[PDB]
């Protein structure tokens, strides 16, 4: 028995030992020469408001037109950005609702909570009403993160250390992802669908084949609990936040922590991360009411969103990169550009 | 989905009659609806429209005054009132759905008409051929015109083509001059610019022959054109 | 003719311009604090404390002005303000008396609805009742004594441009005694009122089992009625001037105490205005960049 | 009970040391790549004029 | 300027937006309570006598007063990071026995403990508390059966219910940290028939009075 736990140790210890073997040049001491990118002043172009309570988490549609914002007052509003339209209402049966989730081809939007299930909802409809598709029972910890592999398939993380790929038209979990120690806050899945990564409140992200069904690799550095989590566009990185109030970028092959974005100032934890579409710029929502702008690369903080009255919760970047979308717990959604 | 319609029949001119559309299996109280007539070997003629929750409503200079558009939701019903009919009047009525909200599909589904017979600015609108000779399996263009660019502001080139099958009500083919309404067989194209548009048929086969109607939503009134009959 | 001087009450000016200057400094400060606070706060900007707001403005209206004007009065005789502007003068005075009183009214049935009927104040305070009542306000105030315009003539009991006594008499006490009813009834009965649910809560929540509100209540109403009250009664049961005493100055001063202490009453024992209050002096550093 | 959790743990840390071993700077590298060849098509890192933009003052 | 469909798609939003205020007006008028406590603390049974795979949400209707009592207790996963969910809840309803010494790893010290979490929660500190003490008819015995100096060497003075049961009130009261901005509400159930949910309604309501009391200003 505690031959296995030392069996454990020398395994991390050589896992440690190779990570520092391959830490051959800091990324700072390289990204330093390259130009620093200016203040990023980003006005509030749009103010999408008629929430009534907490802003939980929103999403961007593929088109970058139409995002869905979810609240605990227990509606998922679809605004239409360009012009602060209500597209449509849906009101949930549980209004605890903690993440949503917009389908790429658009049809059906999800959203989880404190009820343990995900449910779908199809938009594209004959009777013209969205009427929830289904409701994917099978978890036994609150959802924490959902999002749309495809029309037939998603994956979704929940607070009982487990995460899962679901199929829509089954209703049954075809894969369950195990191996976190502790609740599981956040996912996102990579650009090309294959792998995705989920962050836990055991301070620690996997990256999960979904095909595959078991973890690859596991990445550490964080003092406390990931609450975000971004796949940088290429694919090949991933940038975390966390209550330690530290943003880190990951890198995939590298295996190993790549940088770490804070501030002395900054002191509260970060409640979700989002790159731009270059992949230059990481914006964060910070518990202090109000979002900052990092150059990924060089880790400057660039500029600062303070425009929301109480913490910011959510925030997406547009497939174009046109705008950032930043949801509040004042229940306002403002879109910056 | 389901829009019967009732109240027509003979009415000697001057009378009064109120046309019912029972509207079942959709969402009716969210779905603006519309009154559109056919003279009895004519193309089709914009009536009347009722927003949802009746906030707005339009009518055809030709009726202003005249007919009286309402709707009840919690009985799932529209209603139509008409006074002082003359003969231009005889026609057949379809109620008509539209949900308007971005990326929607406004005049999706129409009804099933009723006969109604009478005992004895807007942006002009035409078709090319009134009637074409077709080949089964070949590929046949339409082509319309309209008096002024369809093209607004936004992007949104509002042309609407529908398909009148002999004996059937019309249904909609495109929307927005590109956009394809959800179930037909794929083989139909929209395209062109403001003031000149086109409907492709590629690898035409049976259930193609029929009117095609070309319509604007740019402004009320909905000009519809002439009629385009593809016959074998 | 437009002078008041008489060697009786030589003792009292020196006391009166203190006075004055003090109730000047008192309710300027409080009311540009208020109103400060309201600015910067949106939290604060809720419909019931728009009828403290407009309390606010009418009482700044006769801090900044109006006052000044009395204590100049109650000085040398010199007036620089002429004839015409005195008309002009007791208006806005007499409107912003009115004014404060209406909204006295107002917070008081706000307050009595909120704490007995909570169910029952949107119905009255939504976004147009609220901004109807806040105008309609405005509109009595104006309209009570527009008709009597052109007597604002000099009183020298009052040394202070301001209604004649003698002449208009009939119309101007009714429209006093309309005041002086509505002022005392309202804020004598909702905040009975008030005090009546709140016992009545804590007898019920006293049964199941093994003074603050009563302060503040009897303060408001002392304070209203220590203010209005001398002066109202005073002119409403003296048709003929006789004033014994020149009381009819020192009643007069007693209205000036309202605007002294309604920021006090309304909002800075109120706990969100403290608040706010608080988290400006704290977070200075921090709120110095804010906005 | 637990022998089952160890038994995972180790097999899996086993699983984990075989992955192919590439030095930080190549990725260091490939993002700076990455991020130097979309920089024209960031409209938030460098903002398009208000004649492209879509979310123009309202 | 708006196209002829623009301006139905503005009327959908202003219908959207109208609904939207009714239903948060009516959300508004119910009333919220958070349910903690132990399951074998007579939870269940309390809540239902009081009712006349994850979060369950149960409804009331007394005195024209509709409450949502949301029992959280099968949520088996991390707090504080859900519990801030229910930081506009109007109150906290948390039951307890007075019989819990039984399960001796001493349960009385672990409800101890879970009290002085869940009051000086930065999320509750304006969210009072309505305590409720159960297991009266056979605590009445069992405190005899042994005194409460096996759990509190202090004790009551004289081993009596009426004692010992004021002397716990007094040991879970002073738990609470910020006596000006909570009144915890104390009731012993003693299996009545309905006075749990009278006196749920006498502790809403008071509470009711008190935030609108502070809202006017008056308090």
């Known amino acids: 028995l505690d031959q296995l736990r030392q069996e454990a140790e020398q395994l991390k210890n050589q896992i440690r030992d190779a990570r520092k073997a391959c830490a051959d040049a800091t990324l700072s001491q390289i990204t330093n020469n390259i130009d620093p990118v200016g203040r990023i002043q980003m006005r509030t172009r749009r103010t999408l408001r008629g929430h009534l309570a907490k802003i939980y988490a929103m999403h961007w549609g593929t088109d970058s037109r139409l995002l869905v914002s979810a609240s605990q007052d227990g509606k998922l509003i679809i605004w239409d950005s360009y012009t602060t339209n209500k597209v449509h209402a849906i009101p949930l049966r549980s209004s605890w609702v903690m993440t949503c989730a917009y389908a790429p081809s658009g049809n059906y939007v999800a959203c989880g909570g404190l009820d343990n299930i995900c449910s779908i909802y199809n938009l594209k409809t004959r009777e013209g009403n969205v009427r929830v598709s289904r409701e994917l029972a099978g978890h036994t910890g609150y959802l924490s993160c959902c999002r749309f592999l495809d029309d037939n398939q998603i994956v979704t993380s929940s607070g009982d250390t487990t995460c899962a790929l679901w199929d829509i038209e089954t209703g049954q979990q075809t894969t369950t992802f195990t191996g976190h120690t502790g609740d599981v806050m956040s996912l996102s899945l990579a650009p090309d669908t294959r792998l995705f990564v989920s962050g836990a409140c055991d301070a620690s992200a996997k990256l999960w084949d979904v095909r595959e069904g078991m973890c690859r690799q596991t990445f550490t550095g964080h003092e406390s609990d990931i609450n975000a989590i971004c796949f940088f566009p290429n694919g090949n990185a991933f940038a975390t936040g966390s209550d330690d109030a530290t943003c880190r970028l990951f890198d995939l092959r590298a295996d190993q922590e790549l940088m770490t974005y804070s501030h002395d100032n900054i002191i509260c934890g970060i409640t979700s991360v989002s790159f731009s579409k270059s992949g230059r710029l990481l914006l964060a929502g910070y518990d202090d009411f109000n979002c900052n702008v990092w150059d990924a690369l060089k880790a400057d903080r660039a500029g600062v969103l303070a425009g929301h009255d109480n913490r910011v919760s959510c925030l997406g970047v547009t497939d174009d990169g046109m705008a950032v979308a930043t949801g509040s717990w004042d229940s306002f959604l403002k879109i910056w550009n | 989905v389901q829009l019967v319609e009732s109240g027509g029949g003979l009415v000697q001119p001057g009378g009064s009659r109120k046309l019912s559309c029972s509207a079942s299996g959709f969402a009716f109280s969210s779905f603006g609806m519309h009154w559109v007539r056919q003279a009895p070997e004519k193309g089709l003629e914009w009536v009347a429209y009722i927003s949802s929750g009746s906030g707005t409503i339009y009518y055809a200079d030709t009726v202003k005054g005249r007919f009286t558009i309402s709707r009840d939701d919690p009985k799932n019903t529209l209603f139509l009132q008409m006074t002082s009919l003359r003969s231009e009047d005889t026609a057949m009525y379809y109620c008509v759905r539209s949900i308007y909200y971005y990326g929607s599909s406004p005049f999706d589904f129409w009804g099933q008409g009723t006969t109604l017979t009478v005992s004895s600015s807007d942006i002009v609108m035409t078709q090319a051929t009134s009637s074409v000779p077709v080949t089964p399996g070949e590929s046949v263009s339409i082509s319309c015109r309209s008096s002024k660019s369809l093209l607004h502001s936004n992007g949104n080139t509002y042309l609407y083509w529908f398909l009148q099958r002999p004996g059937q009500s019309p249904q909609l083919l495109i929307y927005r001059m590109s956009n394809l309404a959800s179930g037909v067989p794929d083989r139909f194209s929209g395209s062109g610019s403001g003031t000149a548009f086109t409907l492709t048929i590629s690898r035409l086969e049976a259930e193609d022959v029929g009117v095609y109607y070309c319509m604007q939503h740019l402004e009320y009134p909905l000009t519809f054109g002439a009629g385009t009959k593809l016959e074998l | 003719n437009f002078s008041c001087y008489h060697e009786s009450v030589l003792g009292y000016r020196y006391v009166a311009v203190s006075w004055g200057v003090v109730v000047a400094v008192t309710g300027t400060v409080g009311n540009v604090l208020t109103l400060l606070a309201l600015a910067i706060q949106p939290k604060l900007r809720t419909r019931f404390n728009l009828l403290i707001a407009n309390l606010t403005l009418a009482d700044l209206l006769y801090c900044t002005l109006l006052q000044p004007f009395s204590v100049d009065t109650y000085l040398h005789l010199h007036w620089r303000t002429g004839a015409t502007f005195c008309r002009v003068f007791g208006l806005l005075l007499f409107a912003s008396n009115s004014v404060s009183i209406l909204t006295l009214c107002l917070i008081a049935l706000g307050r009595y609805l909120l704490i007995a009927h909570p169910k029952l104040f949107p119905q009255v305070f939504s976004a147009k009742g609220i901004v109807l009542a806040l105008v309609s306000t405005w509109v009595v105030g104006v309209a009570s004594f527009a008709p009597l315009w052109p007597i604002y003539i000099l009183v020298p009991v009052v040394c202070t441009c301001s209604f004649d006594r003698i002449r208009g008499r009939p119309y101007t006490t009714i429209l006093m005694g309309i005041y002086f009813v509505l002022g005392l009834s309202s804020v004598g009965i909702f905040y009975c009122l008030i005090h009546r649910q709140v016992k009545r809560a804590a007898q019920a929540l006293d049964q199941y089992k093994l003074g603050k509100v009563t302060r503040m209540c009897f303060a408001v109403f002392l304070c209203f009625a220590l203010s209005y009250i001398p002066f109202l009664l005073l002119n409403i049961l003296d048709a003929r001037v006789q004033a014994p005493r020149v009381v009819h100055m020192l009643a007069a001063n007693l209205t000036w105490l309202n605007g002294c202490i309604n920021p006090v009453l309304y909002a800075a024992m109120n706990r969100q205005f403290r608040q706010a209050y608080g988290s400006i002096l704290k977070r200075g550093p921090r709120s110095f960049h804010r906005l | ?58 | 300027t708006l196209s002829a469909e623009d301006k139905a798609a503005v009327e959908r939003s202003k219908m959207i937006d109208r609904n939207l205020r009714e239903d948060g007006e009516k959300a508004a008028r119910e009333v919220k309570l958070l349910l903690l406590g132990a399951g074998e603390s007579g939870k269940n049974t309390i809540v239902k006598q009081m009712k006349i795979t994850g979060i369950v949400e149960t409804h009331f209707t007394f005195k024209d007063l509709h409450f949502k009592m949301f029992d959280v207790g099968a949520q088996r996963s991390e707090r504080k990071k859900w519990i801030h969910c229910f930081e506009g809840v109007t109150a906290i309803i948390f039951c307890v026995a007075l019989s819990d010494y039984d399960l001796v790893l001493n349960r009385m010290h672990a409800s101890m403990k879970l009290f002085d979490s869940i009051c000086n929660n930065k999320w509750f500190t304006d969210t009072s508390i309505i305590l409720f003490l159960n297991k009266k008819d056979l605590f009445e015995e069992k405190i005899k059966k042994s005194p409460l100096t096996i759990c509190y060497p202090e004790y009551a003075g004289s081993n009596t219910y009426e004692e010992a049961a004021a002397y716990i009130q007094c040991q879970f009261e002073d738990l609470n940290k910020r006596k000006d901005t909570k009144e915890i509400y104390t009731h012993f159930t003693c299996s009545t028939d309905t006075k749990n949910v009278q006196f749920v309604f006498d502790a809403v309501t008071d509470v009711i009075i008190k935030n609108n009391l502070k809202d006017c200003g008056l308090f």
Do not use: G, W
């Open chain 4, 1 to 58: 009970a637990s022998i089952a959790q160890a038994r995972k743990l180790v097999e899996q840390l086993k699983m984990e040391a075989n992955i192919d071993r590439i030095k930080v700077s190549k990725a260091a590298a490939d993002l700076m790549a990455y991020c130097e060849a979309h920089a024209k098509e960031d409209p938030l890192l460098t903002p398009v004029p208000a004649s492209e933009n879509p979310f123009r003052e309202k």
